[PDB]
Design a binder for this molecule. Structure first.
Ligand SMILES: OC[C@H]1O[C@H](O[C@@H]2[C@@H](O[C@@H]3[C@H](O)[C@H](O)O[C@H](CO)[C@H]3O)O[C@H](CO)[C@@H](O)[C@@H]2O)[C@@H](O)[C@@H](O)[C@@H]1O
Ligand SMILES: [Ca+2]
Length: 241
């Protein structure tokens, strides 16, 4: 009914099953995991070692993006995918992934966009989609919200809930200890047996991308008779039911 330690990244980040592995620019310190420094052309990631077999879960992420007018980037991505620790151009991680991505995009690559950044969005992939970095992934996203999470003078949190086809992302960015709406969609199909992870990238523009904690909660949810005769591990990630 509560916190799943084996799927949580918690300081001092010395968890042992080694519960998380890192690669690229990633460093561990006693107060945060820094995926990238504020230097150009960096890619870094951290990935849960144990595959998650919960159908119904909620991941809380305490993260921090910060640096030195409109000239910073590129953002963080939070993952729940079949493959782990594979570097790539998608905020540090492979493209054509299988599963779920939540992008915390801080830089408008699309030069004539009406969209206010930073922008949070979700993308579900069965390996057949490419993330168009140059268009901020707009043509492959399912939903998104504008989110003011960068350079705040207090803690910034995100909640990603997934249960029974329903994917919710909510924010806590204004120090009011309240969740605010961002994303709420249905007909999302994902398998169990995927891995949680997080990554960030910087290009010609940079920023510190830090994860302070990821806390995975197991939700107590009733399912239908029929639902339980599925091999939930072989479901193909899918959208629109
Ligand atoms: O990290 C950001 C970005 O870096 C590279 O993209 C280049 C960048 O060029 C910008 C842009 O022209 C802006 O007006 O000024 C910036 C500094 O003053 C400059 O670096 O962004 C453009 C997209 O708008 C690209 O066409 C440039 O090549 C790449 O590595 C990107 O992947 C990365 O997103
Ligand atoms: Ca972008």
């Amino acid at each position: 009914e509560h916190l799943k330690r084996e799927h949580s990244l918690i300081k001092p980040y010395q968890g042992v099953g080694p519960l998380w592995d890192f690669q690229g620019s990633t460093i561990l310190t006693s107060q945060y995991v820094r995926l990238t420094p504020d230097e150009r052309s960096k890619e870094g990631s951290i990935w849960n070692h144990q595959p998650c077999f919960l159908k119904d879960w909620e991941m809380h992420v305490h993260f921090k993006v910060h640096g030195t007018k409109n000239l910073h980037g590129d953002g963080i991505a939070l993952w729940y995918t079949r493959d782990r620790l594979v570097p790539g151009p998608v905020f540090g991680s492979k493209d054509n992934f299988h599963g779920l991505a939540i992008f915390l995009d801080t830089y408008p690559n699309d030069e004539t966009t009406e969209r206010v950044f930073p922008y949070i969005s979700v993308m579900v992939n069965n390996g057949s989609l490419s993330y168009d970095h140059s268009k901020d992934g707009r043509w492959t996203e399912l939903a998104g919200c504008t989110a003011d999470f960068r350079n705040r003078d207090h803690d910034t949190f995100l909640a990603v809930r997934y249960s029974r086809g329903r994917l919710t992302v909510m924010t806590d960015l204004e120090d009011k200890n309240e969740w605010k709406n961002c994303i709420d969609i249905t007909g999302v199909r994902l398998p169990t047996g995927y891995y949680f992870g997080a990554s960030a990238g910087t290009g010609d523009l940079s920023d510190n991308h830090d994860i302070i904690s990821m806390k995975l909660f197991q939700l107590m949810v009733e399912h239908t008779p029929d639902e339980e005769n599925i091999d939930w591990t072989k479901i193909e990630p899918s959208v629109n039911f």
